[PDB]
Design an enzyme around this catalytic site. Structure first.
Site, PDB file in Angstrom:
ATOM      1  N   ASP A  35       0.818  -1.224   0.000  1.00  0.00           N
ATOM      2  CA  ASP A  35       0.000   0.000   0.000  1.00  0.00           C
ATOM      3  C   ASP A  35       0.840   1.258   0.000  1.00  0.00           C
ATOM      4  OD1 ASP A  35      -2.263   1.501   2.462  1.00  0.00           O
ATOM      5  OD2 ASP A  35      -2.080   1.841   0.332  1.00  0.00           O
ATOM      6  N   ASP A 221      -1.404   5.553  -5.626  1.00  0.00           N
ATOM      7  CA  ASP A 221      -1.792   4.743  -4.447  1.00  0.00           C
ATOM      8  C   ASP A 221      -2.157   3.320  -4.835  1.00  0.00           C
ATOM      9  OD1 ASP A 221      -2.943   3.565  -2.190  1.00  0.00           O
ATOM     10  OD2 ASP A 221      -4.441   5.198  -1.890  1.00  0.00           O
TER      11      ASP A 221
HETATM   12  C1  LIG Z   1      -9.449   2.029  -0.226  1.00  0.00           C
HETATM   13  C2  LIG Z   1      -8.485   2.392   0.862  1.00  0.00           C
HETATM   14  O1  LIG Z   1      -8.798   3.144   1.782  1.00  0.00           O
HETATM   15  N1  LIG Z   1      -7.265   1.866   0.768  1.00  0.00           N
HETATM   16  C3  LIG Z   1      -6.275   2.026   1.804  1.00  0.00           C
HETATM   17  C4  LIG Z   1      -5.630   0.685   2.037  1.00  0.00           C
HETATM   18  C5  LIG Z   1      -6.776  -0.269   2.411  1.00  0.00           C
HETATM   19  C6  LIG Z   1      -7.001  -1.416   1.641  1.00  0.00           C
HETATM   20  C7  LIG Z   1      -8.054  -2.265   1.974  1.00  0.00           C
HETATM   21  F1  LIG Z   1      -8.339  -3.491   1.255  1.00  0.00           F
HETATM   22  C8  LIG Z   1      -8.897  -1.971   3.044  1.00  0.00           C
HETATM   23  C9  LIG Z   1      -8.680  -0.824   3.808  1.00  0.00           C
HETATM   24  F2  LIG Z   1      -9.634  -0.608   4.942  1.00  0.00           F
HETATM   25  C10 LIG Z   1      -7.606   0.027   3.492  1.00  0.00           C
HETATM   26  C11 LIG Z   1      -5.285   3.044   1.314  1.00  0.00           C
HETATM   27  O2  LIG Z   1      -4.352   3.311   2.352  1.00  0.00           O
HETATM   28  C12 LIG Z   1      -5.902   4.369   0.907  1.00  0.00           C
HETATM   29  N2  LIG Z   1      -4.846   5.369   0.871  1.00  0.00           N
HETATM   30  C13 LIG Z   1      -5.312   6.757   1.102  1.00  0.00           C
HETATM   31  C14 LIG Z   1      -5.694   7.080   2.515  1.00  0.00           C
HETATM   32  C15 LIG Z   1      -4.939   6.721   3.600  1.00  0.00           C
HETATM   33  C16 LIG Z   1      -5.550   7.112   4.808  1.00  0.00           C
HETATM   34  C17 LIG Z   1      -4.929   6.851   6.150  1.00  0.00           C
HETATM   35  C18 LIG Z   1      -3.946   7.875   6.654  1.00  0.00           C
HETATM   36  C19 LIG Z   1      -2.768   7.942   5.683  1.00  0.00           C
HETATM   37  C20 LIG Z   1      -4.654   9.203   6.870  1.00  0.00           C
HETATM   38  C21 LIG Z   1      -3.451   7.487   8.051  1.00  0.00           C
HETATM   39  C22 LIG Z   1      -6.790   7.715   4.639  1.00  0.00           C
HETATM   40  S1  LIG Z   1      -7.187   7.798   2.955  1.00  0.00           S
HETATM   41  C23 LIG Z   1      -4.765   7.937   0.289  1.00  0.00           C
HETATM   42  C24 LIG Z   1      -6.191   7.423   0.032  1.00  0.00           C
END
Ligand SMILES: CC(=O)N[C@@H](Cc1cc(F)cc(F)c1)[C@H](O)CNC1(c2cc(CC(C)(C)C)cs2)CC1
Length: 372
Positions: A35, A221
């Protein structure tokens, strides 16, 4: 840089790509989602309906408690748990072991996925966005500080050529792409933030103020499936994509990303869906390059031939997600504050059109395209 990591990724469509890791002594094997859109390394550390295994701290001779809790809220899902440090390695990886920060996940909500086969997540973006705060050193940062591994990794995500791909830690593997790598600056080290200076659909400039494409940011991402576009940009793209494909007509739930559309097996009308070109800021002044996405990337197949529209509305800026990265080899050159794109060796097929990384292009006032 090197053969051992080629094809070390797997996954299911729309549920991310994962790589095999082991944590603790003796080594416990977990599948870990890769990720670049977050910066925490975290793992199932307790039963869950959707986990087939999980990290057992008490079974690890090398575990240390950090006596501090953590939580991370993603777009939809979230988990909380306990911070520790343990010894970590990637079996089909470089030949090393590091002590890294790990969030032992105790509770979660809409995080683990039923289909899944992965039990944790490897946040590869920078310390700035790490929880609980920037003093929690990310996994890639520790692997670099602790070994001789160069500060660079590359992702070749393939799209069903049950998905697969490679994560080359430590370098670039010239066997995974053709043509030239083209590089765009990492604008600031937090997410993998970049600047989109121009957008064309079937060769027509969207003609927006280039600030709109980066409003409030554009990132690369691998943990987000779709191409996610700011509201004004999303509206303009769906407008042209509708008009290019107007020969046929679709439910509204389709353009909203909700309900699938179907055609008779082998008859999906690819030619009526346009190509999308994203122009990225280049390395030299007034110079950019373009990646071209084909409809085969943004019409993601769900199990007749059936698909969801894999572009979605954002209120947090542009997200270049897994579907954009598929069929490109994407180099995260942290050491040089840049990200490189090349046509991947698992490139997406059309009988008449190809995904491309092309340059150079001249583009004036690219500085003006950044938001704030
Ligand atoms: C769909 C999703 O959200 N994917 C997760 C990975 C993921 C995959 C999955 F299968 C299930 C999940 F619950 C999460 C991924 O980090 C998204 N990256 C971003 C964000 C990160 C954050 C967290 C911070 C960085 C603020 C602490 C908020 S939005 C930039 C958009």
């Amino acid at each position: 840089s090197f053969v051992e990591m080629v094809d070390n990724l797997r996954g299911k469509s729309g549920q991310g790509y994962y790589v095999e890791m082991t944590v603790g002594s003796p080594p416990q094997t977990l599948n870990i989602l890769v990720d670049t859109g977050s910066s925490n390394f975290a793992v199932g550390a307790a039963p869950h309906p959707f986990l087939h295994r999980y990290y057992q701290r008490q079974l690890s001779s090398t575990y240390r408690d950090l006596r501090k809790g953590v939580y991370v809220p993603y777009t939809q899902g979230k988990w909380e748990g306990e911070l520790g440090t343990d010894l970590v390695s990637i079996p089909h990886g470089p030949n090393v072991t590091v002590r890294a920060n790990i969030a032992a996940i105790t509770e979660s909500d809409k995080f683990f996925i039923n289909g899944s086969n992965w039990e944790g997540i490897l946040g590869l973006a920078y310390a700035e966005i790490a929880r609980p705060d920037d003093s929690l050193e990310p996994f890639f940062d520790s692997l670099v500080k602790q070994t001789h591994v160069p500060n660079l990794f590359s992702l070749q995500l393939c799209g069903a050529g049950s998905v697969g791909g490679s994560m080359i830690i430590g370098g670039i593997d010239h066997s995974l792409y053709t043509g030239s790598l083209w590089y765009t600056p990492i604008r600031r080290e937090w997410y993998y933030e970049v600047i989109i200076v121009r957008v064309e659909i079937n060769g027509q400039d969207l003609k927006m103020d280039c600030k709109e494409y980066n409003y409030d940011k554009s990132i690369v991402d691998s943990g987000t499936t779709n191409l996610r576009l700011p509201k004004k940009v999303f509206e303009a793209a769906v407008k042209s994509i509708k008009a290019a494909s107007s020969t046929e007509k679709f439910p509204d739930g389709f353009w909203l990303g909700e309900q699938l559309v179907c055609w008779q097996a082998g008859t999906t009308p690819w030619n009526i869906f346009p190509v999308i070109s994203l122009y990225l800021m280049g390395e030299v002044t007034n110079q950019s390059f373009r990646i071209t996405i084909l409809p085969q990337q943004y019409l993601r197949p769900v199990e007749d031939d059936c698909y969801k529209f894999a572009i979605s509305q954002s209120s947090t800026g542009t997200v270049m997600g897994a579907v954009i990265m598929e069929g490109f080899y994407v180099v995260f050159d942290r050491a040089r504050k840049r990200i490189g794109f090349a046509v991947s060796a698992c490139h997406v097929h059309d009988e008449f059109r190809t995904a491309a990384v092309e340059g150079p292009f001249v583009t004036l006032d690219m500085e003006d395209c950044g938001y704030n």
